[PDB]
PDB file of C-alpha atoms in Angstrom:
ATOM      1  CA  UNK A   1     -14.448 -31.800 -14.144  1.00  0.00           C
ATOM      2  CA  UNK A   2     -13.378 -32.825 -17.669  1.00  0.00           C
ATOM      3  CA  UNK A   3     -15.134 -31.722 -20.821  1.00  0.00           C
ATOM      4  CA  UNK A   4     -15.098 -31.420 -24.638  1.00  0.00           C
ATOM      5  CA  UNK A   5     -12.844 -33.346 -27.056  1.00  0.00           C
ATOM      6  CA  UNK A   6     -11.988 -36.202 -24.705  1.00  0.00           C
ATOM      7  CA  UNK A   7     -15.209 -36.238 -22.609  1.00  0.00           C
ATOM      8  CA  UNK A   8     -17.797 -36.988 -25.322  1.00  0.00           C
ATOM      9  CA  UNK A   9     -18.365 -33.311 -26.008  1.00  0.00           C
ATOM     10  CA  UNK A  10     -19.614 -32.968 -22.393  1.00  0.00           C
ATOM     11  CA  UNK A  11     -20.245 -29.364 -21.464  1.00  0.00           C
ATOM     12  CA  UNK A  12     -19.280 -28.209 -17.976  1.00  0.00           C
ATOM     13  CA  UNK A  13     -21.948 -27.928 -15.224  1.00  0.00           C
ATOM     14  CA  UNK A  14     -22.847 -24.458 -13.948  1.00  0.00           C
ATOM     15  CA  UNK A  15     -22.073 -22.989 -17.379  1.00  0.00           C
ATOM     16  CA  UNK A  16     -18.311 -23.429 -16.766  1.00  0.00           C
ATOM     17  CA  UNK A  17     -15.877 -22.890 -19.673  1.00  0.00           C
ATOM     18  CA  UNK A  18     -14.269 -26.033 -21.107  1.00  0.00           C
ATOM     19  CA  UNK A  19     -10.525 -25.373 -21.465  1.00  0.00           C
ATOM     20  CA  UNK A  20      -8.551 -26.191 -24.610  1.00  0.00           C
ATOM     21  CA  UNK A  21      -7.025 -29.218 -22.852  1.00  0.00           C
ATOM     22  CA  UNK A  22     -10.456 -30.398 -21.656  1.00  0.00           C
ATOM     23  CA  UNK A  23     -11.138 -29.096 -18.107  1.00  0.00           C
ATOM     24  CA  UNK A  24     -13.825 -27.024 -16.391  1.00  0.00           C
ATOM     25  CA  UNK A  25     -13.310 -23.564 -14.810  1.00  0.00           C
ATOM     26  CA  UNK A  26     -13.987 -19.821 -14.885  1.00  0.00           C
ATOM     27  CA  UNK A  27     -10.560 -18.127 -15.299  1.00  0.00           C
ATOM     28  CA  UNK A  28      -9.195 -16.836 -18.592  1.00  0.00           C
ATOM     29  CA  UNK A  29      -7.251 -20.150 -18.734  1.00  0.00           C
ATOM     30  CA  UNK A  30     -10.554 -21.965 -19.242  1.00  0.00           C
ATOM     31  CA  UNK A  31     -12.633 -19.252 -20.999  1.00  0.00           C
ATOM     32  CA  UNK A  32     -10.160 -17.388 -23.192  1.00  0.00           C
ATOM     33  CA  UNK A  33      -7.921 -18.592 -26.012  1.00  0.00           C
ATOM     34  CA  UNK A  34      -8.585 -22.271 -26.825  1.00  0.00           C
ATOM     35  CA  UNK A  35     -11.874 -22.431 -24.899  1.00  0.00           C
ATOM     36  CA  UNK A  36     -13.924 -25.390 -26.247  1.00  0.00           C
ATOM     37  CA  UNK A  37     -17.322 -24.607 -24.725  1.00  0.00           C
ATOM     38  CA  UNK A  38     -19.514 -22.243 -22.661  1.00  0.00           C
ATOM     39  CA  UNK A  39     -16.813 -19.598 -23.126  1.00  0.00           C
ATOM     40  CA  UNK A  40     -19.163 -16.515 -23.023  1.00  0.00           C
ATOM     41  CA  UNK A  41     -22.289 -17.994 -21.367  1.00  0.00           C
ATOM     42  CA  UNK A  42     -23.904 -21.404 -21.434  1.00  0.00           C
ATOM     43  CA  UNK A  43      -1.297 -13.817 -11.362  1.00  0.00           C
ATOM     44  CA  UNK A  44      -0.388 -10.463  -9.708  1.00  0.00           C
ATOM     45  CA  UNK A  45       0.853  -9.364  -6.251  1.00  0.00           C
ATOM     46  CA  UNK A  46      -1.238 -12.053  -4.548  1.00  0.00           C
ATOM     47  CA  UNK A  47       1.431 -14.567  -5.679  1.00  0.00           C
ATOM     48  CA  UNK A  48       4.062 -12.646  -3.873  1.00  0.00           C
ATOM     49  CA  UNK A  49       1.981 -11.999  -0.684  1.00  0.00           C
ATOM     50  CA  UNK A  50      -0.480 -14.840   0.102  1.00  0.00           C
ATOM     51  CA  UNK A  51      -3.404 -14.399   2.444  1.00  0.00           C
ATOM     52  CA  UNK A  52      -1.561 -16.245   5.233  1.00  0.00           C
ATOM     53  CA  UNK A  53       1.441 -13.901   4.994  1.00  0.00           C
ATOM     54  CA  UNK A  54      -0.697 -10.719   4.876  1.00  0.00           C
ATOM     55  CA  UNK A  55      -2.633 -11.911   7.903  1.00  0.00           C
ATOM     56  CA  UNK A  56       0.460 -12.904   9.872  1.00  0.00           C
ATOM     57  CA  UNK A  57       2.241  -9.607   9.091  1.00  0.00           C
ATOM     58  CA  UNK A  58      -0.823  -7.569   9.991  1.00  0.00           C
ATOM     59  CA  UNK A  59      -1.347  -9.703  13.032  1.00  0.00           C
ATOM     60  CA  UNK A  60      -3.200  -7.429  15.513  1.00  0.00           C
ATOM     61  CA  UNK A  61      -4.974  -4.963  13.243  1.00  0.00           C
ATOM     62  CA  UNK A  62      -8.359  -6.540  14.063  1.00  0.00           C
ATOM     63  CA  UNK A  63      -7.956  -6.152  17.768  1.00  0.00           C
ATOM     64  CA  UNK A  64     -10.995  -4.916  19.609  1.00  0.00           C
ATOM     65  CA  UNK A  65      -9.033  -1.816  20.637  1.00  0.00           C
ATOM     66  CA  UNK A  66      -8.011  -0.959  17.050  1.00  0.00           C
ATOM     67  CA  UNK A  67     -10.514   1.577  15.705  1.00  0.00           C
ATOM     68  CA  UNK A  68     -10.039   0.277  12.133  1.00  0.00           C
ATOM     69  CA  UNK A  69     -10.791  -3.313  13.293  1.00  0.00           C
ATOM     70  CA  UNK A  70     -12.180  -5.409  10.489  1.00  0.00           C
ATOM     71  CA  UNK A  71     -11.589  -2.740   7.823  1.00  0.00           C
ATOM     72  CA  UNK A  72      -8.375  -3.623   6.101  1.00  0.00           C
ATOM     73  CA  UNK A  73      -9.041  -6.873   4.284  1.00  0.00           C
ATOM     74  CA  UNK A  74      -6.834  -8.961   2.048  1.00  0.00           C
ATOM     75  CA  UNK A  75      -9.586  -8.634  -0.590  1.00  0.00           C
ATOM     76  CA  UNK A  76      -9.362  -4.822  -0.485  1.00  0.00           C
ATOM     77  CA  UNK A  77      -5.533  -5.000  -0.689  1.00  0.00           C
ATOM     78  CA  UNK A  78      -5.661  -7.234  -3.748  1.00  0.00           C
ATOM     79  CA  UNK A  79      -8.399  -5.167  -5.459  1.00  0.00           C
ATOM     80  CA  UNK A  80      -6.457  -1.977  -4.907  1.00  0.00           C
ATOM     81  CA  UNK A  81      -3.216  -3.556  -6.131  1.00  0.00           C
ATOM     82  CA  UNK A  82      -5.003  -4.756  -9.331  1.00  0.00           C
ATOM     83  CA  UNK A  83      -5.227  -1.070 -10.236  1.00  0.00           C
ATOM     84  CA  UNK A  84      -1.441  -0.612  -9.946  1.00  0.00           C
ATOM     85  CA  UNK A  85      -0.048  -3.728 -11.629  1.00  0.00           C
ATOM     86  CA  UNK A  86       3.577  -2.404 -11.482  1.00  0.00           C
ATOM     87  CA  UNK A  87       3.302  -2.576  -7.662  1.00  0.00           C
ATOM     88  CA  UNK A  88       4.886  -5.815  -6.520  1.00  0.00           C
ATOM     89  CA  UNK A  89       5.278  -6.724 -10.234  1.00  0.00           C
ATOM     90  CA  UNK A  90       8.456  -4.834 -11.076  1.00  0.00           C
ATOM     91  CA  UNK A  91      11.902  -6.464 -11.036  1.00  0.00           C
ATOM     92  CA  UNK A  92      12.760  -9.925  -9.908  1.00  0.00           C
ATOM     93  CA  UNK A  93      10.885 -11.856  -7.242  1.00  0.00           C
ATOM     94  CA  UNK A  94      13.107 -10.711  -4.362  1.00  0.00           C
ATOM     95  CA  UNK A  95      12.570  -7.113  -5.481  1.00  0.00           C
ATOM     96  CA  UNK A  96       8.788  -7.700  -5.631  1.00  0.00           C
ATOM     97  CA  UNK A  97       8.642  -9.050  -2.091  1.00  0.00           C
ATOM     98  CA  UNK A  98      10.851  -6.138  -0.924  1.00  0.00           C
ATOM     99  CA  UNK A  99       8.477  -3.574  -2.537  1.00  0.00           C
ATOM    100  CA  UNK A 100       5.547  -5.096  -0.691  1.00  0.00           C
ATOM    101  CA  UNK A 101       7.557  -5.281   2.607  1.00  0.00           C
ATOM    102  CA  UNK A 102       8.602  -1.631   2.217  1.00  0.00           C
ATOM    103  CA  UNK A 103       5.064  -0.464   1.321  1.00  0.00           C
ATOM    104  CA  UNK A 104       3.609  -2.404   4.208  1.00  0.00           C
ATOM    105  CA  UNK A 105       6.398  -1.150   6.509  1.00  0.00           C
ATOM    106  CA  UNK A 106       5.751   2.530   5.820  1.00  0.00           C
ATOM    107  CA  UNK A 107       1.965   2.285   5.866  1.00  0.00           C
ATOM    108  CA  UNK A 108       2.111   0.140   9.072  1.00  0.00           C
ATOM    109  CA  UNK A 109       3.995   2.940  10.724  1.00  0.00           C
ATOM    110  CA  UNK A 110       1.392   5.529   9.640  1.00  0.00           C
ATOM    111  CA  UNK A 111      -1.396   3.435  11.189  1.00  0.00           C
ATOM    112  CA  UNK A 112       0.359   1.687  14.114  1.00  0.00           C
ATOM    113  CA  UNK A 113      -1.276   0.887  17.421  1.00  0.00           C
ATOM    114  CA  UNK A 114       1.893  -0.671  18.862  1.00  0.00           C
ATOM    115  CA  UNK A 115       3.735  -0.021  22.128  1.00  0.00           C
ATOM    116  CA  UNK A 116       7.017  -1.474  23.410  1.00  0.00           C
ATOM    117  CA  UNK A 117       5.501  -4.283  25.412  1.00  0.00           C
ATOM    118  CA  UNK A 118       2.723  -5.157  22.997  1.00  0.00           C
ATOM    119  CA  UNK A 119       1.781  -8.761  22.352  1.00  0.00           C
ATOM    120  CA  UNK A 120       4.030 -10.077  19.606  1.00  0.00           C
ATOM    121  CA  UNK A 121       6.030  -6.830  19.686  1.00  0.00           C
ATOM    122  CA  UNK A 122       5.263  -3.304  18.444  1.00  0.00           C
ATOM    123  CA  UNK A 123       5.879  -4.386  14.829  1.00  0.00           C
ATOM    124  CA  UNK A 124       2.745  -6.595  14.707  1.00  0.00           C
ATOM    125  CA  UNK A 125       0.334  -3.659  15.398  1.00  0.00           C
ATOM    126  CA  UNK A 126       0.298  -1.981  11.955  1.00  0.00           C
ATOM    127  CA  UNK A 127      -3.024  -0.992  10.318  1.00  0.00           C
ATOM    128  CA  UNK A 128      -4.737  -0.351  13.646  1.00  0.00           C
ATOM    129  CA  UNK A 129      -6.124   3.052  12.573  1.00  0.00           C
ATOM    130  CA  UNK A 130      -7.817   4.301   9.394  1.00  0.00           C
ATOM    131  CA  UNK A 131      -8.118   7.988  10.295  1.00  0.00           C
ATOM    132  CA  UNK A 132      -6.005  10.570  12.031  1.00  0.00           C
ATOM    133  CA  UNK A 133      -6.465  10.553  15.756  1.00  0.00           C
ATOM    134  CA  UNK A 134      -7.591  13.890  17.318  1.00  0.00           C
ATOM    135  CA  UNK A 135      -6.725  15.832  14.154  1.00  0.00           C
ATOM    136  CA  UNK A 136      -5.834  19.463  14.925  1.00  0.00           C
ATOM    137  CA  UNK A 137      -7.250  20.771  11.602  1.00  0.00           C
ATOM    138  CA  UNK A 138      -9.555  19.907   8.689  1.00  0.00           C
ATOM    139  CA  UNK A 139      -6.467  20.612   6.512  1.00  0.00           C
ATOM    140  CA  UNK A 140      -8.203  22.753   3.921  1.00  0.00           C
ATOM    141  CA  UNK A 141      -5.807  24.954   1.984  1.00  0.00           C
ATOM    142  CA  UNK A 142      -8.098  26.381  -0.740  1.00  0.00           C
ATOM    143  CA  UNK A 143      -6.842  26.609  -4.329  1.00  0.00           C
ATOM    144  CA  UNK A 144      -8.383  27.025  -7.708  1.00  0.00           C
ATOM    145  CA  UNK A 145      -7.109  23.518  -8.601  1.00  0.00           C
ATOM    146  CA  UNK A 146      -8.561  21.819  -5.527  1.00  0.00           C
ATOM    147  CA  UNK A 147     -11.278  23.684  -3.811  1.00  0.00           C
ATOM    148  CA  UNK A 148     -12.371  22.424  -0.430  1.00  0.00           C
ATOM    149  CA  UNK A 149     -15.807  20.802  -0.456  1.00  0.00           C
ATOM    150  CA  UNK A 150     -18.101  22.414   2.140  1.00  0.00           C
ATOM    151  CA  UNK A 151     -18.736  20.148   5.131  1.00  0.00           C
ATOM    152  CA  UNK A 152     -15.779  17.934   4.188  1.00  0.00           C
ATOM    153  CA  UNK A 153     -12.521  17.369   6.089  1.00  0.00           C
ATOM    154  CA  UNK A 154      -9.057  16.359   4.829  1.00  0.00           C
ATOM    155  CA  UNK A 155      -7.425  14.948   7.920  1.00  0.00           C
ATOM    156  CA  UNK A 156      -5.286  11.785   7.557  1.00  0.00           C
ATOM    157  CA  UNK A 157      -7.104   8.690   6.296  1.00  0.00           C
ATOM    158  CA  UNK A 158      -6.068   5.246   5.152  1.00  0.00           C
ATOM    159  CA  UNK A 159      -2.723   3.458   5.159  1.00  0.00           C
ATOM    160  CA  UNK A 160      -0.615   6.451   4.088  1.00  0.00           C
ATOM    161  CA  UNK A 161      -2.682   8.855   6.208  1.00  0.00           C
ATOM    162  CA  UNK A 162      -3.566  10.869   3.104  1.00  0.00           C
ATOM    163  CA  UNK A 163      -4.036  14.485   4.198  1.00  0.00           C
ATOM    164  CA  UNK A 164      -5.000  17.926   2.729  1.00  0.00           C
ATOM    165  CA  UNK A 165      -7.418  18.795  -0.091  1.00  0.00           C
ATOM    166  CA  UNK A 166      -4.425  19.203  -2.444  1.00  0.00           C
ATOM    167  CA  UNK A 167      -3.533  15.498  -2.003  1.00  0.00           C
ATOM    168  CA  UNK A 168      -7.086  14.076  -1.940  1.00  0.00           C
ATOM    169  CA  UNK A 169      -7.788  15.895  -5.203  1.00  0.00           C
ATOM    170  CA  UNK A 170      -4.901  14.324  -7.215  1.00  0.00           C
ATOM    171  CA  UNK A 171      -5.269  10.944  -5.561  1.00  0.00           C
ATOM    172  CA  UNK A 172      -8.992  10.745  -6.461  1.00  0.00           C
ATOM    173  CA  UNK A 173      -8.411  11.881 -10.027  1.00  0.00           C
ATOM    174  CA  UNK A 174      -5.783   9.163 -10.522  1.00  0.00           C
ATOM    175  CA  UNK A 175      -7.978   6.424  -9.187  1.00  0.00           C
ATOM    176  CA  UNK A 176     -11.273   7.630 -10.751  1.00  0.00           C
ATOM    177  CA  UNK A 177     -13.033   8.568  -7.491  1.00  0.00           C
ATOM    178  CA  UNK A 178     -14.023  12.117  -6.467  1.00  0.00           C
ATOM    179  CA  UNK A 179     -12.075  12.387  -3.178  1.00  0.00           C
ATOM    180  CA  UNK A 180     -12.287  16.182  -3.055  1.00  0.00           C
ATOM    181  CA  UNK A 181     -16.072  15.876  -2.797  1.00  0.00           C
ATOM    182  CA  UNK A 182     -16.108  12.618  -0.780  1.00  0.00           C
ATOM    183  CA  UNK A 183     -12.815  12.398   1.190  1.00  0.00           C
ATOM    184  CA  UNK A 184     -14.434  10.064   3.806  1.00  0.00           C
ATOM    185  CA  UNK A 185     -14.340   7.240   1.243  1.00  0.00           C
ATOM    186  CA  UNK A 186     -10.668   6.804   2.129  1.00  0.00           C
ATOM    187  CA  UNK A 187     -11.879   5.758   5.602  1.00  0.00           C
ATOM    188  CA  UNK A 188     -15.154   3.991   4.663  1.00  0.00           C
ATOM    189  CA  UNK A 189     -14.111   1.971   1.550  1.00  0.00           C
ATOM    190  CA  UNK A 190     -11.031  -0.194   2.121  1.00  0.00           C
ATOM    191  CA  UNK A 191     -10.370  -0.690  -1.573  1.00  0.00           C
ATOM    192  CA  UNK A 192     -10.307   3.092  -2.055  1.00  0.00           C
ATOM    193  CA  UNK A 193      -8.249   3.370   1.129  1.00  0.00           C
ATOM    194  CA  UNK A 194      -5.500   1.009  -0.174  1.00  0.00           C
ATOM    195  CA  UNK A 195      -5.691   2.664  -3.609  1.00  0.00           C
ATOM    196  CA  UNK A 196      -4.804   6.094  -2.161  1.00  0.00           C
ATOM    197  CA  UNK A 197      -1.792   4.563  -0.437  1.00  0.00           C
ATOM    198  CA  UNK A 198      -0.668   2.859  -3.667  1.00  0.00           C
ATOM    199  CA  UNK A 199      -1.214   6.134  -5.543  1.00  0.00           C
ATOM    200  CA  UNK A 200       1.109   7.828  -3.075  1.00  0.00           C
ATOM    201  CA  UNK A 201       3.644   4.957  -3.372  1.00  0.00           C
ATOM    202  CA  UNK A 202       3.595   5.021  -7.153  1.00  0.00           C
ATOM    203  CA  UNK A 203       3.665   8.745  -7.874  1.00  0.00           C
ATOM    204  CA  UNK A 204       6.615  11.142  -8.167  1.00  0.00           C
ATOM    205  CA  UNK A 205       5.998  14.555  -6.632  1.00  0.00           C
ATOM    206  CA  UNK A 206       8.135  17.655  -6.937  1.00  0.00           C
ATOM    207  CA  UNK A 207      11.762  16.857  -6.142  1.00  0.00           C
ATOM    208  CA  UNK A 208      10.797  13.366  -4.894  1.00  0.00           C
ATOM    209  CA  UNK A 209      10.876  10.216  -6.970  1.00  0.00           C
ATOM    210  CA  UNK A 210       8.234   7.597  -6.401  1.00  0.00           C
ATOM    211  CA  UNK A 211       8.832   5.192  -3.456  1.00  0.00           C
ATOM    212  CA  UNK A 212       8.167   2.566  -6.111  1.00  0.00           C
ATOM    213  CA  UNK A 213      11.131   3.567  -8.219  1.00  0.00           C
ATOM    214  CA  UNK A 214      13.440   3.748  -5.145  1.00  0.00           C
ATOM    215  CA  UNK A 215      12.625   0.329  -3.803  1.00  0.00           C
ATOM    216  CA  UNK A 216      12.843  -1.353  -7.235  1.00  0.00           C
ATOM    217  CA  UNK A 217      16.269   0.195  -8.007  1.00  0.00           C
ATOM    218  CA  UNK A 218      14.974   2.410 -10.801  1.00  0.00           C
ATOM    219  CA  UNK A 219      15.969   5.624  -9.076  1.00  0.00           C
ATOM    220  CA  UNK A 220      19.432   7.065  -9.211  1.00  0.00           C
ATOM    221  CA  UNK A 221      20.169  10.134  -7.160  1.00  0.00           C
ATOM    222  CA  UNK A 222      20.703  13.565  -8.670  1.00  0.00           C
ATOM    223  CA  UNK A 223      23.734  15.678  -7.802  1.00  0.00           C
ATOM    224  CA  UNK A 224      21.556  17.547  -5.364  1.00  0.00           C
ATOM    225  CA  UNK A 225      20.444  14.166  -3.849  1.00  0.00           C
ATOM    226  CA  UNK A 226      24.085  13.013  -3.593  1.00  0.00           C
ATOM    227  CA  UNK A 227      25.247  16.161  -1.821  1.00  0.00           C
ATOM    228  CA  UNK A 228      22.256  15.697   0.521  1.00  0.00           C
ATOM    229  CA  UNK A 229      23.278  12.184   1.564  1.00  0.00           C
ATOM    230  CA  UNK A 230      20.245  10.692  -0.177  1.00  0.00           C
ATOM    231  CA  UNK A 231      21.278   7.228  -1.411  1.00  0.00           C
ATOM    232  CA  UNK A 232      18.893   4.475  -2.510  1.00  0.00           C
ATOM    233  CA  UNK A 233      17.231   2.366   0.135  1.00  0.00           C
ATOM    234  CA  UNK A 234      14.319   2.453   2.623  1.00  0.00           C
ATOM    235  CA  UNK A 235      15.673   5.605   4.252  1.00  0.00           C
ATOM    236  CA  UNK A 236      15.006   7.793   1.282  1.00  0.00           C
ATOM    237  CA  UNK A 237      11.455   6.323   1.206  1.00  0.00           C
ATOM    238  CA  UNK A 238      10.989   7.551   4.836  1.00  0.00           C
ATOM    239  CA  UNK A 239      12.271  10.927   3.585  1.00  0.00           C
ATOM    240  CA  UNK A 240       9.700  10.933   0.801  1.00  0.00           C
ATOM    241  CA  UNK A 241       6.860  10.138   3.280  1.00  0.00           C
ATOM    242  CA  UNK A 242       7.724  12.520   6.119  1.00  0.00           C
ATOM    243  CA  UNK A 243      11.351  13.731   5.825  1.00  0.00           C
ATOM    244  CA  UNK A 244      10.545  17.319   6.754  1.00  0.00           C
ATOM    245  CA  UNK A 245       9.918  16.244  10.279  1.00  0.00           C
ATOM    246  CA  UNK A 246      11.827  13.004  10.752  1.00  0.00           C
ATOM    247  CA  UNK A 247      15.015  13.211   8.677  1.00  0.00           C
ATOM    248  CA  UNK A 248      18.469  14.823   8.907  1.00  0.00           C
ATOM    249  CA  UNK A 249      18.786  15.186  12.705  1.00  0.00           C
ATOM    250  CA  UNK A 250      20.143  11.865  13.860  1.00  0.00           C
ATOM    251  CA  UNK A 251      18.394   8.820  15.351  1.00  0.00           C
ATOM    252  CA  UNK A 252      14.638   9.375  15.517  1.00  0.00           C
ATOM    253  CA  UNK A 253      12.091   6.989  17.013  1.00  0.00           C
ATOM    254  CA  UNK A 254       9.580   7.491  14.173  1.00  0.00           C
ATOM    255  CA  UNK A 255      12.177   6.486  11.586  1.00  0.00           C
ATOM    256  CA  UNK A 256      13.263   3.571  13.736  1.00  0.00           C
ATOM    257  CA  UNK A 257       9.628   2.402  14.059  1.00  0.00           C
ATOM    258  CA  UNK A 258       9.328   2.429  10.257  1.00  0.00           C
ATOM    259  CA  UNK A 259      12.540   0.375  10.130  1.00  0.00           C
ATOM    260  CA  UNK A 260      11.378  -2.170  12.667  1.00  0.00           C
ATOM    261  CA  UNK A 261       8.225  -2.899  10.650  1.00  0.00           C
ATOM    262  CA  UNK A 262      10.258  -3.171   7.457  1.00  0.00           C
ATOM    263  CA  UNK A 263      12.744  -5.585   9.145  1.00  0.00           C
ATOM    264  CA  UNK A 264      10.030  -7.831  10.518  1.00  0.00           C
ATOM    265  CA  UNK A 265       8.309  -7.971   7.161  1.00  0.00           C
ATOM    266  CA  UNK A 266      11.517  -8.646   5.181  1.00  0.00           C
ATOM    267  CA  UNK A 267      12.195 -11.381   7.754  1.00  0.00           C
ATOM    268  CA  UNK A 268       8.829 -13.003   7.035  1.00  0.00           C
ATOM    269  CA  UNK A 269       9.361 -12.717   3.298  1.00  0.00           C
ATOM    270  CA  UNK A 270      12.790 -14.450   3.634  1.00  0.00           C
ATOM    271  CA  UNK A 271      14.664 -11.505   2.128  1.00  0.00           C
ATOM    272  CA  UNK A 272      17.143  -8.889   3.172  1.00  0.00           C
ATOM    273  CA  UNK A 273      16.168  -5.276   3.740  1.00  0.00           C
ATOM    274  CA  UNK A 274      19.052  -3.838   1.770  1.00  0.00           C
ATOM    275  CA  UNK A 275      21.082  -0.985   3.105  1.00  0.00           C
ATOM    276  CA  UNK A 276      20.705   2.741   3.722  1.00  0.00           C
ATOM    277  CA  UNK A 277      17.741   2.011   5.987  1.00  0.00           C
ATOM    278  CA  UNK A 278      17.581   5.393   7.695  1.00  0.00           C
ATOM    279  CA  UNK A 279      17.481   9.076   6.870  1.00  0.00           C
ATOM    280  CA  UNK A 280      19.253  10.198  10.030  1.00  0.00           C
ATOM    281  CA  UNK A 281      21.960  11.980   7.952  1.00  0.00           C
ATOM    282  CA  UNK A 282      19.861  12.989   4.846  1.00  0.00           C
ATOM    283  CA  UNK A 283      18.627  16.471   3.948  1.00  0.00           C
ATOM    284  CA  UNK A 284      14.900  16.339   3.793  1.00  0.00           C
ATOM    285  CA  UNK A 285      13.566  16.535   0.235  1.00  0.00           C
ATOM    286  CA  UNK A 286      11.289  19.249   1.330  1.00  0.00           C
TER     287      UNK A 286
END
């Protein structure tokens, strides 16, 4: 609907802002700078990963047999990403798509329900789970910095399978949610769930860079990294996530599963994966 200074001063119906160029709408484009009328009353990662793509990549997550069925929505992914605008918004477009592919690859592995003969292949069964299956512990390691909340448990939750009081604490503080007190939010609120995974993705810890910096080419190895065989690529991201267990001892099915997801996703995004895909020959960071 047209409006304003070519529409006889017409205001927009439903209290819609009249844009500077004379059109009706609710975005900043209509209501901000230049807005002709009803301005106060009467382009992020979504451009790189559209709903259709997200849904096709995460093809079987809403299977009846997936305990997280229905939980991980596109709306929650976008809302979470809005809090981490550098995610999928750093570097050129190819790099942005690759960040999202890599993030989705790693988190799909953490939450996979796949099996070798699964419909549409094992790499379409990411995001099947939202909490650790049969956890062996509540993962409380008390500290003055992050005391364990009584009655609460810190088993894996969400797309990065966030675990331990000493990770829920920092994650919650960064995102403005008290996850030490209410760790179950990571499994009951999908926006919080995605936010903890993005927090992990975006945050350097100890001798590890952020996954974000690695995938966007902002990380260069240290001497110690170089002697350890740690060169930029998806492999070092696997190392960051779980290198203590999976890295430095040759071909490993967990690492390969992470790769297969990443390859399928890069495929769908029309980009290459880049090199150094594995951590078969890398010293674990830890």
